[PDB]
Amino acid sequence: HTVELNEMFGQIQSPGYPDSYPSDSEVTWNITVPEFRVQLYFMHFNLESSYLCEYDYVKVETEDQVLATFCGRETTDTEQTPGQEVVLSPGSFMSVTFRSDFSNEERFTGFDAHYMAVDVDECKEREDEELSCDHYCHNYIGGYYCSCRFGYILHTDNRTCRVECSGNLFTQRTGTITSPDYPNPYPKSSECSYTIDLEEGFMVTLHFEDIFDIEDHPEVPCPYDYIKIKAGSKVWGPFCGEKSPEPISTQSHSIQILFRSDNSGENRGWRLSYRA
Amino acid sequence: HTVELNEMFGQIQSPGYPDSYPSDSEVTWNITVPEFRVQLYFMHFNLESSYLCEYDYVKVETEDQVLATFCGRETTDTEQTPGQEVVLSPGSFMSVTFRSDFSNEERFTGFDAHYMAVDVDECKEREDEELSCDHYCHNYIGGYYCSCRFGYILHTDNRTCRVECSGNLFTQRTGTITSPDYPNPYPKSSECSYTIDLEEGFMVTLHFEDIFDIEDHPEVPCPYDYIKIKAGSKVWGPFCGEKSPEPISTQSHSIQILFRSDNSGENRGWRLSYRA
Ligand SMILES: *[C@@H]1O[C@H](CO)[C@@H](O)[C@H](O)[C@H]1NC(C)=O
Ligand SMILES: *[C@@H]1O[C@H](CO)[C@@H](O)[C@H](O)[C@H]1NC(C)=O
Ligand SMILES: *[C@@H]1O[C@H](CO)[C@@H](O)[C@H](O)[C@H]1NC(C)=O
Ligand SMILES: *[C@@H]1O[C@H](CO)[C@@H](O)[C@H](O)[C@H]1NC(C)=O
Ligand SMILES: [Ca+2]
Ligand SMILES: [Ca+2]
Ligand SMILES: [Ca+2]
Ligand SMILES: [Ca+2]
Ligand SMILES: [Ca+2]
Ligand SMILES: [Ca+2]
Ligand code: NA
Ligand code: NA
C-alpha cells in the first residue's frame, strides 16, 4: 500500500496495530511539507529483531538519501530501536517504509509514530554561507525575507542592499572624493556617478590616496566591479585591484566618473582627490 | 489611520519613515493570528523623549491589557526605549498605537518594526493546569492533539483516555475483582460492568479489602464517580470515598456490578472479593 498526504502533521501505525501486524506485509508512505522540514518520532516500537533489520523493519529515507532504519524491540537495550530519538529530514520530503519479510514467529504489536512540520530557520540559515541576506535577516514561519540598515535601499533581488550615489556633483577647484561608506566595504549592487566640471582656463589633475580595494581577478579586466572615468572624448579604465592606478592629468575642464559594484564581495573601496 | 491585516508577519513604519514623522500624527494597527501568539521587535527606534511617553510614543496593547509603551531615542541609555527587547502577546491579538502629540522640536526619524507569528506550545501548555491532555500531548504548528498509552482508548472528547471493562464475567465460586489498572489510578471517563452468576444452591458473600479510593464529596452522594451493585430485585449503592462500605451478603445467585468514573480525578480505585 502506497499512501500519501500532507497536512501539518500526521499519525502512522503498522497494519493491524495495536494488534500484531500481518505476515509478509509491505507498506510505504510519502510525506511532504512545502516550506518546512519533516520531524518524526515513535510513541511505540515493537518489531521482529534481526541482523541489520533485514526481516522486519521501518525505514526513514529521503529522495537521494536514507536517513535511518529501525527494527527489534524497544524493551531490549543495546538495540537499533528508535526509542525516544527524533529523526529530522534535511529537505522537505520524508518517506517511510515498513516491511514484514515472510512471517512472525512471535506476534509483534508493530509500531505507532507521529510526524509534524518544523519551520526552517534561515537566520540560523541551516545550510550556511549560501545565497542569503546581505544585512538583516528576518525569519517567519514557512519562510524568510531581508532588510537593510538605515540609509541602505533594498535591491530588486530582494536580497542585497544598495544605495543612491547618483545625486552628487563637485563644483570646487580642490577636493577629495571617496566610495560610499568609505573606508568601510562599499554597498553591493550599486552604480555611482561623480561629476566634476570647471570654468574655462583650468586644467584638472587626479591622484589616488590611502587604500585602494576593488574585487578583481588575474583574469579578464574587472568583470565584477570597476571604476571608469570620462574626460572629454577620451576615457580611462576600467580600474580595480589592490594596486591603485598612477596619478592622471586631464586637459579638459569636464570630467565624469563611474564606479560600479556587483552583488558580491566585501571589498573596502577607494579614495582620491582633484585639484586644478 | 486604522490599518488591519494578518498574513504570517508584517512590517510597520512611522508616517514618513525613514524621514521625520509629520506633526500631530495619530495611527493605529490591529494585528491578529488565528492559532498563534504575536511577536514584535524594533529594527529602528527614534522618537521624541518625554515623561512617561506622553507626547510622542508607540503603544503595544491587547484587548483587555496594555503590554507596554515606548518613547525617546534608542541612542540614549537608561531610557524606556524598546531597543532589542521583544514584546509577546499572551493572546492571539496585538494592537499598536503611534502618536505624535502636537509638533516636533527636532525632527525624529520615527520607528521601524517587524512582527510575525509564533506557534503556541500546548505541551509546555503556556497557561498551565487548565483543561488539557490526559496522557500524551502532541503539539504541531498552529495547534495540538492528544493520544493515549498502550491499552487505553481515546474518548470522544478527544482529550481523556478510557478503557473497555465491559467484556468480563466471573464464573468461579471464589475470586477477587479490582478496578482497571489497580492499584494505580483508574482510567477516566469509563463505565465498567462486572457480572457474577452461580448455579442454584449457593448464596454469595462480599467483602472489601486493601485500599478503597473514589473521588467524592461531603456533599451529595457521589456525583462524580461511584459503584452500584444489583442483586436480584434489590440494589446497593452508590459507594465512594476513602472508607470502604461494610461486607455484604446476598441470597440470590445473580449479581451485577457497575463502576462509573468521570473525566477528572487521580483516584486510585478499589479491590474486593467474592465467595459462596
Ligand atoms: C512516492 O515516493 C516514491 C519514492 O521514489 C516515488 O517513486 C513515488 O512515485 C511516490 N509516489 C507519489 C504518489 O508521490
Ligand atoms: C521580490 O519581491 C517582490 C515582492 O514585492 C516580488 O514581487 C518579486 O517577484 C521578488 N523577486 C525576486 C527575484 O525575488
Ligand atoms: C481595532 O481594534 C480596536 C481596539 O478596541 C477596536 O475598537 C476596533 O473596532 C478594531 N477595528 C478593526 C477593523 O478590527
Ligand atoms: C473530536 O475530534 C474529531 C476528529 O475526528 C472531530 O470530528 C470532533 O468534532 C471533535 N470533538 C470535540 C468535542 O473536540
Ligand atoms: Ca516476519
Ligand atoms: Ca522560515
Ligand atoms: Ca564586490
Ligand atoms: Ca511632537
Ligand atoms: Ca500549536
Ligand atoms: Ca475521578
Ligand atoms: Na567604501
Ligand atoms: Na485502578
Numbering used by the authors:
A (entry chain A), B (entry chain A): 2 to 277
Q: What are the paper's exact sentences on this?
A:
The lectin pathway of complement is activated by complexes comprising a recognition component (mannose-binding lectin, serum ficolins, collectin-LK or collectin-K1) and a serine protease (MASP-1 or MASP-2). MASP-1 activates MASP-2, and MASP-2 cleaves C4 and C4b-bound C2. MASPs are homodimers that circulate as zymogens bound to the collagenous domains of MBL. Each MASP comprises two N-terminal CUB (C1r/C1s, Uegf, and bone morphogenetic protein-1) domains separated by an epidermal growth factor (EGF)-like domain followed by two short complement regulator (SCR) domains and a C-terminal serine protease (SP) domain.
Because there was no structure of rat MASP-1 3D, and the existing structure of rat MASP-2 3D lacked two of the three Ca2+, including those Ca2+ that form part of the binding site for MBL, both rat MASP-1 3D and MASP-2 3D were crystallized in the presence of 2 mM calcium and diffraction data were collected. This resulted in one MASP-1 structure at 3.7 Å resolution and three independent MASP-2 structures at 2.6–2.7 Å resolution. For MASP-1 3D, 276 of its 281 residues could be built into the electron density map. All four crystal structures revealed a dimer of MASP-1 3D or MASP-2 3D, formed by antiparallel neighboring contacts between pairs of CUB1-EGF domains about the crystallographic symmetry axis. The total buried surface area for MASP-1 at the dimer interface was 880 Å2 per molecule (1,760 Å2 in total), whereas the three crystal structures for MASP-2 gave 1,200, 1,090, and 950 Å2 per molecule. All four new crystal structures revealed well-ordered, similar calcium-binding sites in each of the CUB1 and CUB2 domains. In the MASP-1 CUB1 domain, Ca2+ formed contacts with six oxygen atoms in the side chains of Glu49, Asp57, Asp102, Ser104, and Asn105 (distances between 2.3 and 2.4 Å). In the MASP-1 CUB2 domain, Ca2+ now formed contacts with five oxygen atoms in the structurally equivalent side chains of Glu216, Asp226, Asp263, and Ser265. The EGF domains of MASP-1 and MASP-2 also bound calcium. Interestingly, the prediction of 4.26 S from the MASP-1 3D crystal structure was similar to the observed value of 4.53 ± 0.08, while that of 4.18 S from the MASP-2 crystal structure was close to the observed value of 4.09 ± 0.07 S.
